[PDB]
Design an enzyme around this catalytic site. Structure first.
Site, PDB file in Angstrom:
ATOM      1  N   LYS A  11     -79.322 -13.289 -10.134  1.00  0.00           N
ATOM      2  CA  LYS A  11     -78.608 -12.503 -11.252  1.00  0.00           C
ATOM      3  C   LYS A  11     -77.079 -12.186 -11.049  1.00  0.00           C
ATOM      4  O   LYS A  11     -76.747 -12.087  -9.845  1.00  0.00           O
ATOM      5  CB  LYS A  11     -79.431 -11.179 -11.492  1.00  0.00           C
ATOM      6  CG  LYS A  11     -81.044 -11.463 -11.721  1.00  0.00           C
ATOM      7  CD  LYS A  11     -81.090 -12.295 -12.984  1.00  0.00           C
ATOM      8  CE  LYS A  11     -82.734 -12.449 -13.068  1.00  0.00           C
ATOM      9  NZ  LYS A  11     -82.958 -13.028 -14.451  1.00  0.00           N
ATOM     10  N   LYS A  69     -77.677 -13.928 -14.862  1.00  0.00           N
ATOM     11  CA  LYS A  69     -78.325 -15.187 -15.242  1.00  0.00           C
ATOM     12  C   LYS A  69     -77.167 -16.327 -15.157  1.00  0.00           C
ATOM     13  O   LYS A  69     -77.295 -17.226 -14.309  1.00  0.00           O
ATOM     14  CB  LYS A  69     -78.812 -15.292 -16.662  1.00  0.00           C
ATOM     15  CG  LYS A  69     -79.991 -14.063 -16.879  1.00  0.00           C
ATOM     16  CD  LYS A  69     -80.662 -13.974 -18.360  1.00  0.00           C
ATOM     17  CE  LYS A  69     -81.396 -15.372 -18.651  1.00  0.00           C
ATOM     18  NZ  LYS A  69     -82.530 -15.315 -17.690  1.00  0.00           N
ATOM     19  N   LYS A 117     -84.525 -18.539  -6.759  1.00  0.00           N
ATOM     20  CA  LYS A 117     -84.555 -19.663  -7.988  1.00  0.00           C
ATOM     21  C   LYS A 117     -83.234 -19.667  -8.717  1.00  0.00           C
ATOM     22  O   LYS A 117     -82.753 -18.498  -9.232  1.00  0.00           O
ATOM     23  CB  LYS A 117     -85.680 -19.564  -8.883  1.00  0.00           C
ATOM     24  CG  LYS A 117     -86.169 -18.529  -9.457  1.00  0.00           C
ATOM     25  CD  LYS A 117     -87.136 -18.328 -10.163  1.00  0.00           C
ATOM     26  CE  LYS A 117     -87.169 -19.437 -11.612  1.00  0.00           C
ATOM     27  NZ  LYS A 117     -86.330 -18.834 -12.566  1.00  0.00           N
ATOM     28  N   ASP A 127     -81.796 -19.657 -12.364  1.00  0.00           N
ATOM     29  CA  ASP A 127     -82.091 -19.133 -13.664  1.00  0.00           C
ATOM     30  C   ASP A 127     -82.591 -20.161 -14.659  1.00  0.00           C
ATOM     31  O   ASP A 127     -82.049 -20.784 -14.469  1.00  0.00           O
ATOM     32  CB  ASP A 127     -81.326 -18.087 -14.480  1.00  0.00           C
ATOM     33  CG  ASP A 127     -82.203 -16.724 -14.945  1.00  0.00           C
ATOM     34  OD1 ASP A 127     -83.089 -16.826 -15.646  1.00  0.00           O
ATOM     35  OD2 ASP A 127     -81.709 -15.350 -14.600  1.00  0.00           O
ATOM     36  N   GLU A 128     -83.629 -19.987 -15.384  1.00  0.00           N
ATOM     37  CA  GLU A 128     -83.937 -21.162 -16.355  1.00  0.00           C
ATOM     38  C   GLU A 128     -82.943 -21.684 -17.016  1.00  0.00           C
ATOM     39  O   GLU A 128     -82.920 -23.095 -17.283  1.00  0.00           O
ATOM     40  CB  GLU A 128     -85.304 -20.633 -17.029  1.00  0.00           C
ATOM     41  CG  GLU A 128     -84.757 -19.699 -18.331  1.00  0.00           C
ATOM     42  CD  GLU A 128     -84.488 -18.373 -18.116  1.00  0.00           C
ATOM     43  OE1 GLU A 128     -85.081 -17.767 -17.353  1.00  0.00           O
ATOM     44  OE2 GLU A 128     -83.427 -17.809 -18.581  1.00  0.00           O
ATOM     45  N   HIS A 173     -90.876 -23.561 -15.104  1.00  0.00           N
ATOM     46  CA  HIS A 173     -90.687 -22.512 -15.909  1.00  0.00           C
ATOM     47  C   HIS A 173     -90.944 -22.758 -17.285  1.00  0.00           C
ATOM     48  O   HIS A 173     -90.836 -23.720 -17.805  1.00  0.00           O
ATOM     49  CB  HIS A 173     -89.169 -22.192 -15.850  1.00  0.00           C
ATOM     50  CG  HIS A 173     -88.634 -20.997 -16.396  1.00  0.00           C
ATOM     51  ND1 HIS A 173     -88.463 -20.728 -17.893  1.00  0.00           N
ATOM     52  CD2 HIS A 173     -88.386 -19.689 -15.820  1.00  0.00           C
ATOM     53  CE1 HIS A 173     -88.261 -19.420 -18.065  1.00  0.00           C
ATOM     54  NE2 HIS A 173     -88.190 -18.995 -16.863  1.00  0.00           N
ATOM     55  N   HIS A 183     -95.360 -20.352 -14.328  1.00  0.00           N
ATOM     56  CA  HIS A 183     -95.075 -18.817 -14.619  1.00  0.00           C
ATOM     57  C   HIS A 183     -96.399 -18.519 -15.630  1.00  0.00           C
ATOM     58  O   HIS A 183     -96.727 -19.122 -16.573  1.00  0.00           O
ATOM     59  CB  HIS A 183     -94.024 -18.633 -15.589  1.00  0.00           C
ATOM     60  CG  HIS A 183     -92.644 -18.528 -14.561  1.00  0.00           C
ATOM     61  ND1 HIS A 183     -91.777 -17.667 -14.543  1.00  0.00           N
ATOM     62  CD2 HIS A 183     -92.005 -19.532 -13.833  1.00  0.00           C
ATOM     63  CE1 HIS A 183     -90.700 -17.545 -13.673  1.00  0.00           C
ATOM     64  NE2 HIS A 183     -90.694 -19.030 -13.181  1.00  0.00           N
ATOM     65  N   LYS A 188     -91.875  -6.637 -17.942  1.00  0.00           N
ATOM     66  CA  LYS A 188     -91.008  -6.610 -19.277  1.00  0.00           C
ATOM     67  C   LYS A 188     -91.553  -7.424 -20.371  1.00  0.00           C
ATOM     68  O   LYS A 188     -91.164  -7.308 -21.589  1.00  0.00           O
ATOM     69  CB  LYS A 188     -89.611  -6.860 -18.991  1.00  0.00           C
ATOM     70  CG  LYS A 188     -89.316  -8.137 -18.465  1.00  0.00           C
ATOM     71  CD  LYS A 188     -87.729  -8.208 -18.171  1.00  0.00           C
ATOM     72  CE  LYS A 188     -87.466  -9.532 -17.958  1.00  0.00           C
ATOM     73  NZ  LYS A 188     -86.018  -9.649 -17.203  1.00  0.00           N
ATOM     74  N   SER A 234     -93.465 -13.015 -12.836  1.00  0.00           N
ATOM     75  CA  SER A 234     -92.259 -12.744 -13.029  1.00  0.00           C
ATOM     76  C   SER A 234     -91.716 -12.082 -14.065  1.00  0.00           C
ATOM     77  O   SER A 234     -92.226 -12.366 -15.155  1.00  0.00           O
ATOM     78  CB  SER A 234     -91.443 -14.085 -12.934  1.00  0.00           C
ATOM     79  OG  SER A 234     -90.135 -13.982 -12.700  1.00  0.00           O
TER      80      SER A 234
HETATM   81  O1  LIG Z   1     -85.029 -14.450 -16.752  1.00  0.00           O
HETATM   82  C1  LIG Z   1     -85.815 -13.841 -16.220  1.00  0.00           C
HETATM   83  O2  LIG Z   1     -85.811 -12.702 -16.781  1.00  0.00           O
HETATM   84  C2  LIG Z   1     -86.675 -14.233 -15.086  1.00  0.00           C
HETATM   85  O3  LIG Z   1     -85.641 -14.909 -14.149  1.00  0.00           O
HETATM   86  C3  LIG Z   1     -87.137 -12.676 -14.299  1.00  0.00           C
HETATM   87  O4  LIG Z   1     -86.079 -12.073 -14.076  1.00  0.00           O
HETATM   88  P1  LIG Z   1     -86.295 -10.514 -13.511  1.00  0.00           P
HETATM   89  O5  LIG Z   1     -87.415 -10.494 -12.220  1.00  0.00           O
HETATM   90  O6  LIG Z   1     -84.985  -9.981 -12.849  1.00  0.00           O
HETATM   91  O7  LIG Z   1     -86.935  -9.562 -14.773  1.00  0.00           O
HETATM   92  C4  LIG Z   1     -87.818 -15.110 -15.403  1.00  0.00           C
HETATM   93  O8  LIG Z   1     -87.344 -16.461 -15.830  1.00  0.00           O
HETATM   94  C5  LIG Z   1     -88.848 -14.644 -16.588  1.00  0.00           C
HETATM   95  O9  LIG Z   1     -89.950 -13.944 -15.509  1.00  0.00           O
HETATM   96  C6  LIG Z   1     -89.508 -15.437 -17.320  1.00  0.00           C
HETATM   97  O10 LIG Z   1     -90.357 -14.891 -17.903  1.00  0.00           O
HETATM   98  P2  LIG Z   1     -92.078 -15.432 -17.850  1.00  0.00           P
HETATM   99  O11 LIG Z   1     -92.405 -15.413 -16.455  1.00  0.00           O
HETATM  100  O12 LIG Z   1     -92.807 -14.806 -18.904  1.00  0.00           O
HETATM  101  O13 LIG Z   1     -91.966 -16.647 -18.279  1.00  0.00           O
HETATM  102 MG   LIG Z   2     -85.123 -16.630 -15.543  1.00  0.00          MG
END
Ligand SMILES: O=C(O)[C@@](O)(COP(=O)(O)O)[C@H](O)[C@H](O)COP(=O)(O)O
Ligand SMILES: [Mg+2]
Ligand SMILES: [Mg+2]
Ligand SMILES: [Mg+2]
Lengths: 459, 140, 119, 140, 119, 140
Positions: free
Chosen positions: A164, A166, A190, A192-193, A283, A316, A323, A368
């Protein structure tokens, strides 16, 4: 004889007396017809327009055997506590589907029907993928066992961490963060997506610096390390180009956003990964657009089955406690659907069909999003060892930086595992186990202090 | 703010971020092993062959993805199949450490249903080892 | 834009209604292979909508029959026919077989009508 | 005509061709850092991980262009964001060298607008280091 | 299934008489490139057995002679002729020479009879 | 149940799994050589160049299949062609070991009809050699 004109779908496509075949693909739709449309007709409409039928009678029907090929609505349950909602069951013959093609399967079953005027809402809740169809898929490049074997990691969950912010970090900084997290005791970090290739950070630059961080951290800790480099891209050619470079760099693992990338692109990638021994982290970006509402869409358990067929080593699964939304009973169900060889029908967990994966490897659930050290015992309790838990904020948000952040989470997870193993019940003594460990570990203590009040409960 | 040391802070997978296991904490793990019907086994390696490296990758083309030397350690005797006796496992840990006082030794357990190693942790570090830190001197 | 937000506990529902794609973003895309004008020019078809037709049943027809139905449709005066969305490659009709017969249909209907045909 | 020595005359990027920095020349740089709004940070490395090498390129195909190991050092605490106090930086240099007497230590500063490291020079060489030359014995 | 066992000392003779290939295994195979229905459709031949003919002598004929024999057989009303199983490529007739002459035979017989022909 | 040791139990092809050869077991092999018309020869190598490795493969593409360094030892004099005298071979073994006290030395024999080495066993291990085990300490 050929009789031109419109007639009822139910005449051809409602067959409540049908005995399902061991090779039929079965769907469970949550149907909500328009007022005055009889459930039997609506269910047949869904069966018809997802297999062989259109709106008026065609003559070409007679050239083939509609009996052999038609989708069949074969059972309707009314939904308790619902005026106008039914579960319609459709059986599709195996002949309807292209071998190995998740794309084709989804094109038939969820292609048009969801847009029908004759219904208010439709939701696909579950599919029964029969072994004879499953065997046509390459499926996951490696799966849980092989992955554990390749990484040499056993008897605990795996720990990861999204870098982070992102977007906004340069390649060099990205690798810097990556090294710091990895050396503290995380297994994985990883992209970020949505970190793909952008003006602030071009992918190849990132891949290089990340590879360097992976190797420094590995040499330092003596444990195997990884970073899910994102191969998600605009075109298949680009997607491949990145996967190739990752291979060329010797790194263990890449990631793909299967839903925004798409099934076609994803299956390609999973095959490449199988052919080159790359681990593949999936993801689920965009799933919530489709799976969030109860009345309409496709439920995630279906999107997870799909992914298992398309191919992925991780997927995932959600956190329950974090959250993002995820109810506990349903999650325990689709985690079984992801991991296990054979999953018995269990309506309490949203599992409408017995699913036999006939030796297709298991996908590792990744938990996650918005989790921190206080969730650790709840997490270990829900998923067990075969899961990957990820702390983005939960690591880069630690007051002492990434290495201590990592160290905190690693200690937290290791403590709970030991606790669990020693007999302690984590559902109850959870807070105790964490507290014992904070008083013991300075880095963990700093973490517990900052996120003690932080919970995700609503309405 | 404390700083996590890069020198020489070499870890060893499961449980190496916790305080070193007491002879009784080790016994609690063995109970967990026998309780679940898993196959116990002991593995060992000399000081060099203990850490993950990649010197055999000098012989490879572009195919060194998820290849690392020194994942395999040397099997002590055989895995203890159906041996449901916690006492006898502890005795073999002793027999082994005695026979290789200078080796790294780890206890591992196999699940034969999932066909995977299901847990594993270190039981002996060699005495000459200078590349680890005691649990309190990991941050300065 | 639609990656993770839709799944947030803090909200009940979310819907993306529109996006404003600025020219400077637009210009980074190859975009449609041809577009309306060029399509019309290639097809040599002007001053009216185009007529198309999905072959039916959706699934179950053999490649030979598929082609037959195509030919009959196209010669009647439809501009196009099409595989159904879920017609890909299946046990009842493998794609290359389909492609070949359909090509033949297209050419027969074209020669007969003197209008450009497609499928 | 004097000859520039190949043995063992290892340098260290910016300022390593000048005479070693006095405690006050170091402070003058820190003023420059704070004067311009840049983020100060400290990095350190043990004797081995200090110099650029390429032993991980044994795992590569033809893709080792602009890849070298040991570019990354270990971060001392965190970068000091908005910390506009020259005194406190000098104190952290001391805290760090104290904690790692045998490490190479360097002070670096980041510009967050351009997102790049904007300066960097060495502040501590380890005492055992035999691969450098004093400023006068560089040419014989 | 038939790898080692037939050679065991502990038995005098073994014969595999049948196998049950289950649908779940069958689905993993591409199988026949076309199959009976698609073949008939491709060749445009319906409602009778097909007629074939192995060129003889098995070995010893030149490429040119091979094509000659082929043309004569095909034009008389056979659907197919064929290389003998042991006709591959040899000193008396090299395969590419044969392919080219046979192709010519096939086309001549086809134009003459108006029936699709093959070899 | 005894455990076969991984440390340092380095072997040497033919006969190195038996007890070391007596001067008379050696002579019995030489009788077998001369009895069959084979050409005796002696080869030797210093402590390093004795074992199979692959450091020249750093210069290779994907073509290191069945390439290992140190297959070739140094030839002692020449092969003894048509020399049908068991005595004189033993004398050369002595001449050789004398000249290279610190070398690995092996006796080899060539069949010239098949054009291949037809036998070969070690005759001298250097004294500084610490990477082998006596026949009884191979399993603990
Ligand atoms: O973009 C985000 O928020 C994360 O990188 C988590 O960051 P944090 O740990 O800092 O919250 C993941 O991509 C989410 O978990 C995706 O959600 P899911 O697993 O439901 O698909
Ligand atoms: Mg992410
Ligand atoms: Mg359609
Ligand atoms: Mg024949």
């Amino acid at each position: 004889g050929f009789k031109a004109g419109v007639k009822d779908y139910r005449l051809t496509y409602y067959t409540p007396d049908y005995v399902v075949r061991d090779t039929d693909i079965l769907a469970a739709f949550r149907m909500t017809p328009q007022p005055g449309v009889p459930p039997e007709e609506c269910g047949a409409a869904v069966a018809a327009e997802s297999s062989t039928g259109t709106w008026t009678t065609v003559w070409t029907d007679g050239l083939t055997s509609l009996d052999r090929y038609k989708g069949r609505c074969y059972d309707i349950e009314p939904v308790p506590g619902e005026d106008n909602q039914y579960i319609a069951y459709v059986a599709y013959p195996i002949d309807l589907f292209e071998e190995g093609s998740v794309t084709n399967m989804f094109t038939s079953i969820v292609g048009n029907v969801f847009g029908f005027k004759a219904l208010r809402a439709l939701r696909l809740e579950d599919l029964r993928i029969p072994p004879a169809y499953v065997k046509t898929f390459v499926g996951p490049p490696h799966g849980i066992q092989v992955e554990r074997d390749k990484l040499n990691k056993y008897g605990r969950g795996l720990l990861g961490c999204t870098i982070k912010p992102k977007l906004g970090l340069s390649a060099k900084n990205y690798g810097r963060a990556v090294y710091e997290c990895l050396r503290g005791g995380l297994d994985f970090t990883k992209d970020d997506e949505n970190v793909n290739s952008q003006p602030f950070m071009r992918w190849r630059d990132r891949f290089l610096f990340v590879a360097e961080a992976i190797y420094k951290a590995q040499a330092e800790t003596g444990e195997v390390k990884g970073h899910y480099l994102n191969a998600t891209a605009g075109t298949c050619e680009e997607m491949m180009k990145r996967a190739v470079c990752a291979k060329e760099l010797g790194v263990p693992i890449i990631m793909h956003d299967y839903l925004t990338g798409g099934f076609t692109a994803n299956t390609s990638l999973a095959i490449y990964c199988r052919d080159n021994g790359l681990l593949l982290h999936i993801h689920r970006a965009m799933h919530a657009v489709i799976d969030r509402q109860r009345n309409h869409g496709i439920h995630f358990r279906v999107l997870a089955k799909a992914l298992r067929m398309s191919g992925g080593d991780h997927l995932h699964s959600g956190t329950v406690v974090g959250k993002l939304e995820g109810e506990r009973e349903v999650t325990l169900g689709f985690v079984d659907l992801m991991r296990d060889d054979y999953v018995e029908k269990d309506r309490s967990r949203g599992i409408y069909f017995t699913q036999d994966w006939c030796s297709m490897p298991g996908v590792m659930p990744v938990a996650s999003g918005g989790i921190h050290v206080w969730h650790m015992p709840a997490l270990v309790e829900i998923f067990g060892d075969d899961a990957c838990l990820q702390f983005g904020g939960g690591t880069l948000g630690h007051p002492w930086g990434n290495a201590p952040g990592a160290a905190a989470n690693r200690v937290a997870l290791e403590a709970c595992t030991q606790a669990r193993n020693e007999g302690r019940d984590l559902a109850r003594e959870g807070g105790d186990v964490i507290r014992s460990a904070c008083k013991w570990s300075p880095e963990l203590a700093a973490a517990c202090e900052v996120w003690k009040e932080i919970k995700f409960e609503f309405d | 703010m404390m700083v996590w040391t890069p020198v020489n802070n070499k870890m060893f997978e499961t449980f190496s971020y916790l305080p070193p296991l007491t002879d009784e904490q080790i016994a609690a793990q063995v109970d967990y092993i026998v309780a679940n019907g898993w196959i116990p086994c002991l593995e060992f390696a000399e000081a060099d062959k203990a850490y993950v490296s990649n010197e055999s990758a000098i012989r490879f083309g572009s195919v060194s993805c998820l290849y690392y030397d020194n994942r395999y350690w040397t099997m002590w005797k055989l895995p203890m199949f159906g041996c449901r006796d916690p006492m006898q496992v502890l005795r073999e840990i002793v027999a082994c450490t005695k026979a290789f006082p200078d080796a790294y030794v780890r206890l591992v357990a196999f699940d034969n249903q999932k066909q995977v190693q299901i847990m594993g942790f270190l039981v002996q570090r060699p005495k000459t080892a200078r590349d680890f830190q005691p649990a309190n001197k990991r941050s300065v």
